[model samples]
Target: GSHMGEEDLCAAFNVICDNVGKDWRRLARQLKVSDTKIDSIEDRYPRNLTERVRESLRIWKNTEKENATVAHLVGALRSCQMNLVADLVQEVQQARDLQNRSGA
Candidate 1:
């Protein structure tokens, strides 16, 4: 599955968890995550903003599945004016590419 396997997804998630703050809803909306899903995530993680954001992403991933890619994700981020997060996502992709190249 070239659709971003778990290792790369985990790395991206970590970076997002560290950096994504306050803009989670906007990002989710731009990612096409439904408002009902967003509300459920917030309800599930009333005290944990990171998990809320994380769950929002999980929904996006699950919804997109094989269609998910850093390109689309970055596009969504940029659509929401979240260029910093888009850049961070690209950085994660580049880092993973470097690792795979070296290991290859």
Candidate 2:
């Protein structure tokens, strides 16, 4: 896979935001986001799971910018036993890789 930049990662997060079901907090925990921060996100978006998930991702990437790789994210999802979600992200990454190769 081609190296993904921060913007590309944000786009990937958006895709996840659209498709992720109820286990967003679990995924965030696996991604190393602290429960406290996740709780704050919950407070911020008390009625919205999508926004909570989105903010959790924002914090993860905003804090661990360089270490935030697609591979790492996929690993986190897999570790959480969220294989279908992991596959979704991997598919996005692979498609980007294919497009980058074709364009170059």
lDDT of 2 at 14: 59
Clashing pairs in 2: none
Model 1, 10-98: lDDT tens digits are 54565457665676777777667788877887889888878888777767778776656765666666787878877777666776675
lDDT of 2 by residue, 1-104 (tens): 23455544554575457565667777777767787877787888889888788777667777667767776776666787877777776666776675557653
* Cα distance off (Å), candidate 1, residue 15: 3.8
Instruction: Give residue 12's error in model 2 in angstroms.
Output: 3.0
Clash count, predicted structure 2: 0
Clashes of 1: 0
In order, candidate lDDTs are 0.69, 0.70
- List clash counts for every candidate, in order: 0, 0
